[PDB]
Amino acid sequence: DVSLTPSGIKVNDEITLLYPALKYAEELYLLINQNKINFIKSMAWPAFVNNISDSVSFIEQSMIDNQNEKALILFIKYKTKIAGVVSFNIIDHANKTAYIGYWLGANFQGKGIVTNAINKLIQEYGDSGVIKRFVIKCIVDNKKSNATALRCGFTLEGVLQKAEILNGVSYDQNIYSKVI
Ligand SMILES: CC(=O)SCCNC(=O)CCNC(=O)[C@H](O)C(C)(C)COP(=O)(O)OP(=O)(O)OC[C@H]1O[C@@H](n2cnc3c(N)ncnc32)[C@H](O)[C@@H]1OP(=O)(O)O
Numbered sequence: 001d002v003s004l005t006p007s008g009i010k011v012n013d014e015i016t017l018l019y020p021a022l023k024y025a026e027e028l029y030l031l032i033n034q035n036k037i038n039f040i041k042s043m044a045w046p047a048f049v050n051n052i053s054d055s056v057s058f059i060e061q062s063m064i065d066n067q068n069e070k071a072l073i074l075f076i077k078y079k080t081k082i083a084g085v086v087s088f089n090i091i092d093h094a095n096k097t098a099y100i101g102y103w104l105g106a107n108f109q110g111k112g113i114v115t116n117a118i119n120k121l122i123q124e125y126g127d128s129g130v131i132k133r134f135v136i137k138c139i140v141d142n143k144k145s146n147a148t149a150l151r152c153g154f155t156l157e158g159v160l161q162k163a164e165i166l167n168g169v170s171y172d173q174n175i176y177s178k179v180i
């Protein structure tokens, strides 16, 4: 499979999902910083990304988790730029289940980049038999994340009451799945 390269997973001519490396710390930090105000509305970690050292630490932890297959953290490259992150935030090997997360900088939204990335990951891990069940959980009022889950052919399984906390407030999540 020529799409599986040493540097990452080639989605299409414009998108590669890069394995994390320290060389990406600066670009990743700057991207988060540019998007911090908007990102804080939907995620709980951007509020605390205050220096490049925070991105370095994130990369270091991501590399450890990737090595040990606790997670699969990938940096989305669109054309020449890091565009965001797509991940299996949790890999449950015993139950062949992966829980998916994602974000894109504002300048990278509206281009199908995450939908294309997720479809590629599900092909690679799902059609190979590594993962049987893919899961997306997202806050009920997160319009774009819900739309992405549906665009990727996931099915709504239910609502998880008060399951995600942002800034001390618990929000309901939709839970979606795609089963191979
Ligand atoms: C499970 C979780 O991680 S929950 C937390 C999710 N993350 C966040 O909330 C962080 C903040 N938000 C974001 O980063 C973004 O809004 C995201 C990642 C959730 C969604 O980004 P999008 O760019 O909408 O992702 P996606 O890859 O699905 O693209 C769909 C959009 O691209 C358009 N599009 C353009 N080209 C294509 C294409 N080739 N294929 C598919 N869609 C395309 C679609 O029409 C749609 O645009 P619209 O919203 O105007 O209808």
Ligand SMILES: Nc1ncnc2c1ncn2[C@@H]1O[C@H](COP(=O)(O)O)[C@@H](O)[C@H]1O
Pocket (backbone or CB within 6 Å): 043, 044, 045, 049, 058, 073, 085, 086, 087, 089, 101, 102, 103
């Ligand atoms: N400190 C961080 N820097 C960059 N991306 C992150 C960080 N923490 C989480 N993410 C990613 O954010 C996405 C959404 O996760 P969550 O915030 O849990 O909804 C996932 O792709 C995570 O890997």
